[PDB]
Ligand binder design. Structure first.
Ligand SMILES: CS(=O)(=O)NC1(C(=O)O)CCCCC1
Ligand SMILES: CS(=O)(=O)NC1(C(=O)O)CCCCC1
Lengths: 204, 204
């Protein structure tokens, strides 16, 4: 009776871990494919599942950080979104924090993604007339050559600058999508997805 | 490329169906055990998963009605909850609608549960001083012997009546819990729960 409830709770924790992995794989694919509504609905599902979990392995915490990073990147142009208790931190600043917190290799791709988020964190403020806020974002990030070029653009209030077109929002998204392509190949073999794909293939 | 995305979407629909079944089993157990916070968190998870599903088998629709019925029963005393587009329909009235919509046997237990919800739908209004609303609930439900006894109690405004203690809220909950005990035994063999319990048992 007391042992039965204990065995049930452990089984629920096992199933929840499988649901979290599947939902991360679904979120990464939606981000890659640009399926905006599917990403929104899948994020709602991962949030709910995460609140029903208590114990997290190091791998599950990395998986959660991935969902969080993609959620902030998708909301990168939504300056009204508050992802941290400090109301000043913009969505791309919150993404940059999670990017530097994941236990992952700091390869060339990692650094390019980091620098593209830094430039775009400022650019999105400028492209909305929020020039004072761009300087405040700049001070929190920077905490050069590029550093002084960026301060010069904020100071000149030239929102439509050629620098923000070379290191564009679309370039940041494409570099992030190439990274998500590695996460997708890694989680394609998780339990729920593997068992679901096997049921589908058996009906072909 | 176009066929790959199609196979992925079908696998996601298969996994979602397994998540819906597991989450119904988790919700029924929480209701039975009286684990209020676990029920609230699990309901949040089933809602999110349901919004990510498009096709529903007849069995999945029955499963959803079960989650809905238990959700309204749990909110039975919360008269500020609006479960239908018509703002007048109280939570126990909304539960009675789903109870008469499930494709299930109309055994003795089914009818006892139906009649206990009818009496309590009125009683909860009286026990909050909402006497006019109790008469309005009574008219929508009824739409005797019991019928005239109930009208007499509403008319006398005797909120604390001996009738509402014999056919009490606790009796309605206990009868509903015995029914949930049958749903729990039926869904204990669903894919995700069976596979999770097997992982737990293998570590013992
Ligand atoms: C806005 S969020 O913080 O990014 N949302 C999650 C949460 O747990 O809050 C974290 C992982 C993605 C979905 C759920
Ligand atoms: C308030 S509710 O309507 O009862 N919520 C569900 C929904 O889909 O809205 C239905 C099944 C239970 C959880 C999700």
């Amino acid at each position: 009776e007391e042992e039965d409830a204990g065995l049930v709770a452990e089984a629920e924790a096992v199933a929840a871990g499988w649901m979290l992995d599947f939902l991360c794989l679904s979120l990464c694919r939606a981000f890659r494919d640009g399926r905006s509504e599917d990403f929104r609905r899948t994020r709602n599902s991962a949030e709910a599942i995460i609140h029903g979990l208590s114990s997290l392995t190091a791998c599950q915490l990395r998986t959660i950080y991935i969902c969080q990073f993609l959620t902030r990147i998708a909301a990168g142009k939504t300056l009204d979104a508050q992802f941290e208790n400090d109301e000043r931190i913009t969505p791309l600043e919150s993404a940059l924090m999670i990017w530097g917190s994941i236990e992952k290799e700091h390869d060339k791709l990692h650094e390019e993604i980091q620098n593209l988020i830094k430039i775009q964190a400022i650019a999105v403020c400028m492209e909305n007339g929020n020039f004072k806020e761009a300087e405040e974002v700049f001070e929190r990030i920077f905490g050069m050559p590029f550093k002084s070029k960026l301060l010069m653009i904020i100071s000149q209030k030239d929102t439509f600058h050629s620098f923000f077109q070379h290191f564009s929002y679309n370039h940041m998204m494409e570099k992030i999508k190439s990274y998500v392509n590695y996460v997708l190949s890694e989680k394609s073999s998780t339990f729920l997805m593997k068992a679901a794909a096997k049921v589908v293939e058996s009906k072909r």
